[PDB]
Amino acid sequence: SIDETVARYKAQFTQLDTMMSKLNNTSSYLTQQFTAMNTSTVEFINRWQRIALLSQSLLELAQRGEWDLLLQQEVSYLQSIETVMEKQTPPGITRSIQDMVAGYIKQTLDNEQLLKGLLQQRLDELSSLIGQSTRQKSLNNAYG
Amino acid sequence: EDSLGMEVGYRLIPMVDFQQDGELLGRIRSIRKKFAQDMGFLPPVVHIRDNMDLQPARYRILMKGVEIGSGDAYPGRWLAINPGTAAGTLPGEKTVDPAFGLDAIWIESALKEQAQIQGFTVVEASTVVATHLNHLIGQFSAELFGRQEAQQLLDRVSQEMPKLTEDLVPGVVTLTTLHKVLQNLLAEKVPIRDMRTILETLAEHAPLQSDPHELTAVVRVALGRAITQQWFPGNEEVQVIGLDTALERLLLQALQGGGGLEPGLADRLLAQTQEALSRQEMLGAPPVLLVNHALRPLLSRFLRRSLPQLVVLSNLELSDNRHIRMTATIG
């Protein structure tokens, strides 16, 4: 069933391309909040650690080719960034906790630059797979 | 001589013998049967003849005595076709597939499953010859439809719907004109199955038009539902190649006598079209080029002469309810 698998290639292409566009919406929000940093204190480290951890999950799933699971984790990664948008920085910021978060915010940026680079090469591979599958469909109709 | 003939070597005799194997005879009958129900006319019979002077595994395909294709076939072996994505190589006689010209290898029967895992398409010997024969029939569909088959089709449809055919030939259109219109339809892979709409719309435009090329254009719009569904089956997004609006007006100006383009720009038009077939292929979209109605016969005859796989439809033929998106551009 080549026609059915090509449909899956097209559907995954648009879903990954939509994620690569929302990846730039969050890349501008994280870069500006990063430069803005250069008891409720605990629930401030976790809000920026959940972002750094979910960005690690997406990069690991991209390296391992789990694209279906990568699209399920995109939702939780987008929900976690909005939780940082609703809640501002607490007033009690020490020089040590502010620069520790600045290392976690910088971790997500270097994780998205590798994630976007991997999310792009999958779009480049899916375009090859669709082209090869339609050429293979012409062979099967002639000899079938 | 014979309209469609095929000569074969003595190793292919079992493939073409009812006394033993004869796998080809059943396939050739099925080829002619489906061709009569798809394109709407029965192709000429294939005269098969043994030739012990020919090479043992060689076959020839002739049309009116002229050789239109040769090749080899080994009944005990399989042909491993490489569509460009296969890996490694297989032992056997390296050759070329007769339909698309791809690289292929005749492999022993013990390598079929390994060929498949390596990405080859493995095809049996009788299918190689049948597919080659079936490929040439579609390529010469217009030529194999002579004036004899025109009269034969007319009498066949004159008994089904006598009121339409009686008043038509040779009153409004002669047999030569009707034949040339049907040839133009097969020449662009549009079937002549719906003889009602073809002849119905012929009777409405024959008293006002006697040009076969002009009558063909009107018929294609009358067959627009069939032409649309042939390349865009169902009800989804129609993805076509288009012309750059600057190029479309340049071409309309050249036909209107405002000034033609340089012959070097024509070479780019052929190249940009072939690139549009590749870009359309990477998207899983049909290889069709949608152009303004005034430009359709020109670009069809011009591009398809070099790129026959290209389909050129006019804007007046696509159904107005479909969602059209231009996925590739020439220019």
Residue numbers in the entry:
A (entry chain D): 5 to 42, 59 to 164
B (entry chain A): 360 to 690
What's the publication's text?
Type III secretion systems (T3SSs) are membrane-embedded nanomachines that export dedicated proteins from the bacterial cytoplasm. FliD and FliC are found in complex with their dedicated chaperones FliT and FliS, respectively, in the cytoplasm.
Several constructs were tested and the highest quality NMR spectra suitable for solution structure determination were provided by a ternary complex formed between FlhAC and a fused FliT−FliDC construct, wherein FliDC consists of the last 40 C-terminal residues of FliD. The ternary complex was readily crystallized and the X-ray crystallographic structure of the FlhAC−FliT−FliDC ternary complex was determined at 2.75 Å resolution. Two distinct interfaces mediate the formation of the ternary complex. In the major interface, which buries a total surface of 350 Å2, the FliT helix α4 juxtaposes with a hydrophobic cleft of FlhAC located between domains d1 and d2. Two bulky non-polar residues, Leu102 and Tyr106, emanating from FliT helix α4 bury their side chains into the FlhAC hydrophobic dimple. In addition to a network of intimate non-polar contacts, FliT Tyr106 forms an optimal hydrogen bond with the side chain of FlhAC Asp456 (O–H⋯O distance 2.3 Å). Amino acid substitutions that perturbed the binding interface decreased the ternary complex stability, with FliT residues Leu102 and Tyr106 and FlhA residues Asp456 and Leu461 being essential for complex formation.
